[PDB]
Amino acid sequence: RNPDKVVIVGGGTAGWMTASYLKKAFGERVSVTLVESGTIGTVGVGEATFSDIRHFFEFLDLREEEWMPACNATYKLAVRFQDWQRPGHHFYHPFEQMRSVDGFPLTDWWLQNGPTDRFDRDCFVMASLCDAGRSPRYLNGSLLQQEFDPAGLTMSEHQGKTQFPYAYHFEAALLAEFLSGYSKDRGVKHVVDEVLEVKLDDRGWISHVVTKEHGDIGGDLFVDCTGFRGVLLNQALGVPFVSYQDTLPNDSAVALQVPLDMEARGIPPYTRATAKEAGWIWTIPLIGRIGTGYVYAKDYCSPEEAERTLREFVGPEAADVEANHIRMRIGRSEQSWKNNCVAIGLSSGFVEPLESTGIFFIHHAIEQLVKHFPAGDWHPQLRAGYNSAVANVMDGVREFLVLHYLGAARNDTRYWKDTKTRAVPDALAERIERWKVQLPDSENVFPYYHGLPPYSYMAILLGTGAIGLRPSPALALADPAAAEKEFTAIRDRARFLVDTLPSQYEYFAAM
Amino acid sequence: PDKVVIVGGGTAGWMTASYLKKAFGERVSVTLVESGTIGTVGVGEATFSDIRHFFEFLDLREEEWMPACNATYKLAVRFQDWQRPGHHFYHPFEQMRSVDGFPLTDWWLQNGPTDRFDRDCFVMASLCDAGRSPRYLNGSLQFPYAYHFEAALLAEFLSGYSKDRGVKHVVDEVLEVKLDDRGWISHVVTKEHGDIGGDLFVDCTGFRGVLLNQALGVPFVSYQDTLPNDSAVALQVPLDMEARGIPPYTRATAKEAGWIWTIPLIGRIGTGYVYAKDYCSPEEAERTLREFVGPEAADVEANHIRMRIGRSEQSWKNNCVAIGLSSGFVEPLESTGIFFIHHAIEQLVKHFPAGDWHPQLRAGYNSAVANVMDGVREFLVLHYLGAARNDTRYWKDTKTRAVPDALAERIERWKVQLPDSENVFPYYHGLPPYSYMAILLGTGAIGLRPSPALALADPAAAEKEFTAIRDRARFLVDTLPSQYEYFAAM
Ligand SMILES: Cc1cc2nc3c(=O)[nH]c(=O)nc-3n(C[C@H](O)[C@H](O)[C@H](O)COP(=O)(O)OP(=O)(O)OC[C@H]3O[C@@H](n4cnc5c(N)ncnc54)[C@H](O)[C@@H]3O)c2cc1C
Ligand SMILES: Cc1cc2nc3c(=O)[nH]c(=O)nc-3n(C[C@H](O)[C@H](O)[C@H](O)COP(=O)(O)OP(=O)(O)OC[C@H]3O[C@@H](n4cnc5c(N)ncnc54)[C@H](O)[C@@H]3O)c2cc1C
Ligand SMILES: [Cl-]
Ligand SMILES: [Cl-]
């Protein structure tokens, strides 16, 4: 009858997303205490989200009016992949549902007889808005419809049935500060101190966390949000961490924060991923500045050269700003939940920000935490269900990311030559063989949930260009009519939206 | 044009012929060869949640085909006496509702109003108990309801539909299937129409499997080690449906050595006894069925059937694809027979070999077909593993029989975790997570727990949703007409 006590260790994005979500879900029925270090800094990045993100704010009962201005937040409709196939060309991976004609996806029709040479513009409306720098909403908060006009879906069904599950760019520090206010206004205890030790009982479970100036803080469930450190799960409980470095070599990153005149430049409604000599560079647009970073493998490029490459790429306005060098831990823990300790965030695992899935992992974890929340005698099946769910999301996204590099047609430097000599898991090698003949569907991809629908695999395959696809033979005998009218309908609405929608700065100037 | 030759014309063949001709047409040539001495099986009266998409693909409105086939509506399947004598529950064609991330059945396990989950969580469960029509007397209406109909009448209707679009029809005996060098099919030899050749051959010859199983020697994987029901005896009983109404559902009444189906049609009921030989002989299986229906079924002829339970090792070999009973079959507990056909012909259009036969296309089709069979099979075993009835030797053996290691493990999860999208059969097999919920909750031999989180959650949003369902049901029952009144008007 006494409220279960949850102790959260870490004041990063993971920690406050957990505290606010847990407190919103259970209210005063659950006591939440968040302990964070005052000397240890947060990772400083993580500023683009995934198609899942809208569900998180809806669960928190937060409208865009309340949180977006305080975080310098902007809209994200897609990820623009630049120069991944050949110099000077780009394609979008949009957060938009794939339309089908007579049981066949529009991309399959596009392979038979597509209008233009860009699959993304023909099959996705969002690709036209991105190329025009358009805001998804008119000057009155009206989404893609001039006149005005919610939904109770879970996270998975949101990104599965919502036609336009767009995302956001935002400052990772401002969001954490906002969620700290959201949490503390709902009864979340805040303790700023260092956790010196994790005291375990006789049976190996966490008894309490030993702080320096606040004594022993105990509880029933301990949540590790200490980042790459893994203070509780990896260090204290000794849960082994498995690396993904063998399939995804990128281990390093260097990032800047560049204040720019977001007016002459404009605010592009997407994250850009420009392919480079030893990796790729991200461009995350915000209100007032852009967040840019070079994700690379240091075996192909020195940290010194990587920073200079990044500064040249942005230009003179980034010549003197501080550069943040990060050594990434790529992979995941063998299990994210052992005994009474569950890791959420960088402590659980991480893959390179190629598709901005970092915050997605956190969002998925806390949702699965509520779903598999213990209150009785802790049934092993509950913990097993959580660990398999979290691992499948990680393992699935990892396949999707390797596919980016196996599909890349770029082949100039040693880094991009080695991307095809590197050994892949046998599972993905077989699906690629299936995908060459049978364009990816719900039955030839990774079987368990991992946030990626078939049209995502379609977009990366069609856009990166090295893996040749074919249109299914049935479309050579089908009446192309209906498909050509669907192609026309997409082109028509796109032309209407581009000519009627405002830029983002215009939208954000109108409060 | 690509030449497709279909052997067999008993629902499997005509659904294939009409679907292909509507999908492609003129750019594909279809020839159907059916025996004029060998008949259809000839049952298959109830359908599944997929069936509406089939008629929509054929561009057929309900009024075009339903009266011609004596068709009625199927809102659910009523499982009777599977847990205890006199108790029943429904497995409806209605989406499960979610409150704060948890399915309504999970909330019901925590603090449900009534002792009947189906009445609390499903609206149509109230309509079934009240014998309501899903449509008003003026045609008004996610509810993927199915149909009951005469399989014989639908076959003739589709034949007309097929031949009205260029499907070449031949009535003759296929006496031989001649194989070329590779082992593919050159042509089939008829009795007096000569050889009929083509590029693709479709085996729809039923349990015989003349083309796939006999001519090409594709092995058959038996499911009888986990599903012993191998026999069936069926009747067609003309009735004054006005007196006792037309139920908007298929009933599955558990019996001493199996179960009995009751399929309501226009002017008659389709009913049969699915059973296992070791527990019941065909003669007393007939006796039981007649006593179950009554004096109205004392003189009507009885159709005895030896069922082949399982699936072919592969349904597509070389240039031959088997569709229907030739591909595989499981007992009609959930009416998945025509669903298997509808799925197969849809996969056939998807994996159509208009291109010069890539092995990956054939591999994809066989995987889709096999997993639907394996998934449904797992779902049907759950009916018997979950059934609390324990009176006869037949029902006691359902708890000592062999159980797939995969099933046994995810059952142990379901007892705690409850069926979701991540702990069921991971590939498409027509059954959503809420279908598994209904069977477990209804049959009652397998106990379940609510999620421990719901003990700490605010019930307000859930209690509101239960009330919203009961209110909508109360209104619908009071305003909707009988299913009989509906068809009597139209
Ligand atoms: C280069 C890089 C780029 C990224 N890009 C993206 C992106 O584009 N989109 C996206 O969604 N995600 C991205 N991510 C991931 C994202 O940044 C993280 O998931 C999130 O921002 C922070 O997760 P975290 O709190 O676990 O990490 P951290 O910021 O490291 O959290 C650590 C917290 O725990 C505290 N702490 C640590 N040890 C102790 C201790 N003994 N005692 C007390 N407190 C302690 C620390 O003080 C700190 O508050 C990126 C990550 C990196 C490294
Ligand atoms: C007891 C029982 C109950 C069932 N209940 C349901 C239900 O409730 N709901 C549902 O959806 N499905 C049900 N089914 C399945 C359903 O009956 C079938 O899916 C469908 O109705 C018939 O499939 P078929 O054409 O492959 O079989 P068949 O009817 O046997 O087709 C055989 C055809 O091929 C011809 N033929 C055979 N050999 C030759 C030859 N050498 N040469 C030329 N022609 C040949 C025959 O003349 C015949 O026309 C049930 C099946 C059984 C046995
Ligand atoms: Cl990321
Ligand atoms: Cl069936």
Short mmCIF file of C-alpha atoms in Angstrom, two decimals, chain B residues 206-476:
data_model
loop_
_atom_site.label_atom_id
_atom_site.label_comp_id
_atom_site.label_asym_id
_atom_site.label_seq_id
_atom_site.Cartn_x
_atom_site.Cartn_y
_atom_site.Cartn_z
CA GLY B 206 -8.58 -30.51 -53.20
CA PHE B 207 -7.22 -33.10 -50.78
CA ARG B 208 -6.02 -35.23 -53.71
CA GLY B 209 -3.25 -32.85 -54.76
CA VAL B 210 -3.09 -34.35 -58.24
CA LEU B 211 -0.55 -31.83 -59.52
CA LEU B 212 1.58 -30.72 -56.56
CA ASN B 213 1.52 -33.78 -54.30
CA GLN B 214 1.08 -36.67 -56.74
CA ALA B 215 2.65 -35.48 -60.00
CA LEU B 216 5.54 -33.50 -58.51
CA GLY B 217 5.87 -35.50 -55.30
CA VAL B 218 5.80 -32.67 -52.78
CA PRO B 219 5.72 -34.18 -49.26
CA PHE B 220 2.92 -33.41 -46.79
CA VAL B 221 3.56 -32.20 -43.24
CA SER B 222 0.91 -33.58 -40.89
CA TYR B 223 -0.48 -31.45 -38.06
CA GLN B 224 -2.41 -34.37 -36.56
CA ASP B 225 0.19 -34.97 -33.83
CA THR B 226 -1.08 -31.81 -32.13
CA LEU B 227 -4.55 -31.68 -33.69
CA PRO B 228 -6.07 -35.21 -33.70
CA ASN B 229 -9.37 -34.15 -35.31
CA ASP B 230 -9.25 -36.07 -38.58
CA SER B 231 -12.90 -36.63 -39.49
CA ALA B 232 -16.16 -34.74 -39.95
CA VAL B 233 -19.82 -35.39 -40.74
CA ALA B 234 -21.94 -32.52 -42.06
CA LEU B 235 -25.58 -31.73 -42.82
CA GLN B 236 -27.70 -29.04 -44.46
CA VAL B 237 -30.93 -28.52 -42.54
CA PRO B 238 -33.72 -26.40 -44.06
CA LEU B 239 -35.42 -24.39 -41.31
CA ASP B 240 -37.96 -21.64 -40.75
CA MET B 241 -35.27 -19.22 -39.58
CA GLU B 242 -37.99 -16.75 -38.55
CA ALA B 243 -38.95 -18.82 -35.51
CA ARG B 244 -35.57 -19.12 -33.78
CA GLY B 245 -33.82 -16.23 -35.55
CA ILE B 246 -30.70 -15.90 -37.68
CA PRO B 247 -27.66 -15.67 -35.36
CA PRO B 248 -25.05 -13.11 -36.49
CA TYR B 249 -22.27 -15.58 -35.70
CA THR B 250 -20.86 -19.07 -36.17
CA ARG B 251 -21.28 -21.36 -33.16
CA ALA B 252 -18.72 -23.93 -32.04
CA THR B 253 -20.30 -26.21 -29.44
CA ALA B 254 -17.81 -28.49 -27.69
CA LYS B 255 -18.86 -32.15 -27.60
CA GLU B 256 -17.66 -35.45 -26.14
CA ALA B 257 -15.09 -36.20 -28.85
CA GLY B 258 -14.79 -32.88 -30.67
CA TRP B 259 -17.07 -29.98 -31.51
CA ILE B 260 -20.06 -29.05 -33.67
CA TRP B 261 -20.38 -26.01 -35.94
CA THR B 262 -23.64 -24.19 -36.63
CA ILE B 263 -23.68 -21.92 -39.68
CA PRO B 264 -26.90 -19.92 -40.24
CA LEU B 265 -27.89 -19.33 -43.87
CA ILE B 266 -30.97 -18.00 -45.65
CA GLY B 267 -33.53 -20.75 -45.12
CA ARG B 268 -31.18 -23.36 -43.68
CA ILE B 269 -28.31 -24.05 -41.30
CA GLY B 270 -24.96 -25.58 -42.15
CA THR B 271 -23.91 -27.90 -39.34
CA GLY B 272 -21.28 -30.58 -38.82
CA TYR B 273 -19.37 -32.61 -36.24
CA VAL B 274 -15.58 -32.31 -36.23
CA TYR B 275 -14.05 -35.18 -34.26
CA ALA B 276 -11.25 -37.73 -33.87
CA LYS B 277 -11.65 -41.40 -34.82
CA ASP B 278 -10.05 -42.90 -31.71
CA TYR B 279 -12.78 -41.36 -29.57
CA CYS B 280 -15.77 -41.63 -31.90
CA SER B 281 -16.87 -43.69 -34.90
CA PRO B 282 -18.49 -42.12 -38.00
CA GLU B 283 -21.78 -43.85 -37.18
CA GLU B 284 -22.17 -42.41 -33.67
CA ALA B 285 -20.68 -39.14 -34.88
CA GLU B 286 -23.68 -39.04 -37.19
CA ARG B 287 -25.97 -40.06 -34.32
CA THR B 288 -24.70 -37.26 -32.08
CA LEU B 289 -25.11 -34.64 -34.81
CA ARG B 290 -28.71 -35.55 -35.65
CA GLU B 291 -29.71 -35.57 -31.98
CA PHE B 292 -28.03 -32.18 -31.64
CA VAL B 293 -30.04 -30.60 -34.46
CA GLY B 294 -33.24 -32.54 -33.83
CA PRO B 295 -36.18 -34.02 -35.80
CA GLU B 296 -35.66 -31.45 -38.57
CA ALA B 297 -32.48 -33.35 -39.48
CA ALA B 298 -33.72 -36.94 -39.28
CA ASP B 299 -33.94 -37.66 -43.01
CA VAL B 300 -31.40 -35.24 -44.52
CA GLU B 301 -28.36 -36.87 -46.15
CA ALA B 302 -25.06 -36.95 -44.24
CA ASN B 303 -21.70 -35.95 -45.72
CA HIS B 304 -18.79 -37.89 -44.19
CA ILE B 305 -15.30 -36.49 -44.76
CA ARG B 306 -11.79 -37.77 -44.07
CA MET B 307 -9.77 -34.60 -43.44
CA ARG B 308 -6.11 -34.21 -44.36
CA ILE B 309 -4.69 -32.04 -41.58
CA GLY B 310 -1.45 -30.17 -42.18
CA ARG B 311 0.29 -28.51 -45.11
CA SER B 312 2.48 -29.33 -48.10
CA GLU B 313 6.22 -28.94 -47.52
CA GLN B 314 6.06 -26.25 -50.19
CA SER B 315 3.00 -24.91 -52.02
CA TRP B 316 4.92 -23.73 -55.08
CA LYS B 317 7.30 -26.05 -56.92
CA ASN B 318 8.67 -25.22 -60.38
CA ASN B 319 5.66 -23.94 -62.33
CA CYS B 320 2.97 -25.39 -60.07
CA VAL B 321 1.27 -23.61 -57.18
CA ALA B 322 -1.36 -25.36 -55.05
CA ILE B 323 -4.26 -23.31 -53.72
CA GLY B 324 -7.03 -24.58 -51.45
CA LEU B 325 -7.22 -27.99 -49.80
CA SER B 326 -4.33 -29.04 -52.05
CA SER B 327 -2.07 -26.60 -50.21
CA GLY B 328 -3.15 -27.56 -46.70
CA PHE B 329 -5.97 -27.61 -44.17
CA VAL B 330 -6.76 -27.32 -40.46
CA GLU B 331 -10.08 -27.96 -38.69
CA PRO B 332 -12.66 -25.17 -39.26
CA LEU B 333 -12.59 -23.88 -35.68
CA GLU B 334 -12.00 -20.29 -36.81
CA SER B 335 -13.19 -20.61 -40.42
CA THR B 336 -9.78 -20.09 -42.00
CA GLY B 337 -10.19 -22.29 -45.07
CA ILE B 338 -11.32 -19.64 -47.53
CA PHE B 339 -8.97 -17.22 -45.77
CA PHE B 340 -6.09 -19.49 -46.78
CA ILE B 341 -7.31 -19.32 -50.38
CA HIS B 342 -7.82 -15.55 -50.34
CA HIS B 343 -4.35 -15.08 -48.87
CA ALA B 344 -2.76 -17.46 -51.38
CA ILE B 345 -4.25 -15.80 -54.47
CA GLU B 346 -3.22 -12.39 -53.14
CA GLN B 347 0.31 -13.68 -52.62
CA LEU B 348 0.16 -15.19 -56.11
CA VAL B 349 -0.50 -11.79 -57.68
CA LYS B 350 2.27 -10.33 -55.53
CA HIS B 351 4.80 -13.03 -56.43
CA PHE B 352 3.57 -13.51 -60.00
CA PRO B 353 6.16 -15.04 -62.36
CA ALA B 354 5.67 -12.70 -65.32
CA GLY B 355 9.45 -12.48 -65.17
CA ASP B 356 11.55 -15.53 -65.99
CA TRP B 357 11.18 -17.37 -62.68
CA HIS B 358 13.45 -15.91 -60.00
CA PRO B 359 13.81 -18.45 -57.15
CA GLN B 360 13.48 -15.62 -54.61
CA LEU B 361 9.91 -14.90 -55.75
CA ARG B 362 8.92 -18.54 -55.23
CA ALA B 363 10.76 -18.64 -51.90
CA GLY B 364 8.83 -15.59 -50.72
CA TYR B 365 5.46 -17.08 -51.64
CA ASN B 366 6.16 -20.40 -49.92
CA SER B 367 7.27 -18.58 -46.77
CA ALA B 368 4.14 -16.43 -46.67
CA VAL B 369 1.88 -19.44 -47.24
CA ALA B 370 3.66 -21.75 -44.79
CA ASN B 371 3.79 -19.24 -41.93
CA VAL B 372 0.08 -18.44 -42.20
CA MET B 373 -0.53 -22.17 -41.82
CA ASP B 374 1.94 -22.58 -38.95
CA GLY B 375 0.59 -19.51 -37.17
CA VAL B 376 -3.06 -20.53 -37.39
CA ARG B 377 -2.16 -24.09 -36.37
CA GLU B 378 -0.51 -22.75 -33.22
CA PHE B 379 -3.62 -20.65 -32.58
CA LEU B 380 -5.94 -23.65 -32.85
CA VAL B 381 -3.92 -25.81 -30.46
CA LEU B 382 -4.36 -22.99 -27.94
CA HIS B 383 -8.12 -23.62 -28.05
CA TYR B 384 -7.66 -27.13 -26.67
CA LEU B 385 -4.79 -26.26 -24.33
CA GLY B 386 -7.01 -23.52 -22.94
CA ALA B 387 -10.28 -25.44 -22.79
CA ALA B 388 -11.34 -26.17 -19.21
CA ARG B 389 -13.73 -28.95 -20.23
CA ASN B 390 -12.35 -32.15 -18.71
CA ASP B 391 -15.21 -34.66 -18.66
CA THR B 392 -14.40 -37.21 -21.37
CA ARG B 393 -11.25 -39.08 -22.42
CA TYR B 394 -10.94 -36.80 -25.45
CA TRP B 395 -10.72 -33.63 -23.37
CA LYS B 396 -8.34 -35.10 -20.81
CA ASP B 397 -5.94 -36.05 -23.60
CA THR B 398 -5.77 -32.43 -24.77
CA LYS B 399 -3.60 -31.74 -21.72
CA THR B 400 -1.29 -34.74 -22.13
CA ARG B 401 -0.78 -34.54 -25.90
CA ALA B 402 2.34 -33.23 -27.65
CA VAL B 403 2.81 -29.46 -27.64
CA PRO B 404 5.26 -27.46 -29.81
CA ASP B 405 8.18 -26.12 -27.75
CA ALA B 406 7.57 -22.67 -29.23
CA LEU B 407 3.95 -22.66 -28.06
CA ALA B 408 4.73 -24.00 -24.59
CA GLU B 409 7.19 -21.17 -23.96
CA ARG B 410 5.09 -18.22 -25.12
CA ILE B 411 2.21 -19.64 -23.08
CA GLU B 412 4.38 -19.21 -19.98
CA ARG B 413 4.83 -15.59 -21.06
CA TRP B 414 1.12 -15.04 -21.68
CA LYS B 415 0.35 -16.14 -18.12
CA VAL B 416 2.23 -13.06 -16.93
CA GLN B 417 2.87 -10.75 -19.88
CA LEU B 418 -0.44 -11.20 -21.77
CA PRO B 419 -0.54 -11.53 -25.60
CA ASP B 420 0.97 -8.56 -27.43
CA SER B 421 2.57 -7.92 -30.82
CA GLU B 422 5.95 -9.13 -29.55
CA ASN B 423 5.10 -12.43 -27.83
CA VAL B 424 2.88 -14.03 -30.47
CA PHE B 425 3.83 -15.75 -33.73
CA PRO B 426 6.13 -13.07 -35.21
CA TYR B 427 4.96 -13.54 -38.81
CA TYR B 428 1.61 -12.79 -40.45
CA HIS B 429 -1.02 -15.47 -39.87
CA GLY B 430 -4.22 -13.43 -39.88
CA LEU B 431 -4.55 -13.41 -36.09
CA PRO B 432 -3.92 -10.23 -34.05
CA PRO B 433 -2.88 -10.25 -30.35
CA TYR B 434 -6.45 -9.64 -29.11
CA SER B 435 -7.62 -12.89 -30.71
CA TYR B 436 -5.23 -14.81 -28.46
CA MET B 437 -6.59 -12.84 -25.50
CA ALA B 438 -10.18 -13.90 -26.16
CA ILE B 439 -9.34 -17.59 -26.44
CA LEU B 440 -7.28 -17.59 -23.24
CA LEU B 441 -9.83 -15.57 -21.27
CA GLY B 442 -12.82 -17.50 -22.58
CA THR B 443 -11.67 -21.12 -22.53
CA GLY B 444 -10.38 -20.68 -18.99
CA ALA B 445 -7.90 -23.49 -18.28
CA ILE B 446 -4.99 -21.05 -18.48
CA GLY B 447 -4.96 -18.38 -15.77
CA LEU B 448 -3.70 -14.86 -16.45
CA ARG B 449 -2.52 -11.88 -14.42
CA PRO B 450 -3.15 -8.18 -15.03
CA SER B 451 -0.06 -6.00 -15.49
CA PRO B 452 1.26 -5.02 -12.02
CA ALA B 453 1.36 -1.39 -13.19
CA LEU B 454 -2.44 -1.25 -13.34
CA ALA B 455 -2.50 -1.71 -9.56
CA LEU B 456 -0.89 1.73 -9.37
CA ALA B 457 -2.72 3.35 -12.29
CA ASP B 458 -5.71 5.69 -12.20
CA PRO B 459 -8.74 3.53 -13.12
CA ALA B 460 -10.84 6.57 -14.09
CA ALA B 461 -10.00 6.45 -17.80
CA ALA B 462 -10.68 2.71 -17.98
CA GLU B 463 -13.97 2.75 -16.06
CA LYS B 464 -15.04 5.48 -18.47
CA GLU B 465 -14.28 3.30 -21.49
CA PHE B 466 -16.17 0.27 -20.16
CA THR B 467 -19.20 2.49 -19.57
CA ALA B 468 -18.86 3.94 -23.08
CA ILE B 469 -18.94 0.43 -24.53
CA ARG B 470 -21.91 -0.72 -22.45
CA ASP B 471 -23.84 2.43 -23.39
CA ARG B 472 -23.14 2.07 -27.12
CA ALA B 473 -24.14 -1.60 -26.88
CA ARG B 474 -27.32 -0.80 -24.94
CA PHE B 475 -28.27 1.72 -27.64
CA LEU B 476 -27.43 -0.54 -30.59
#
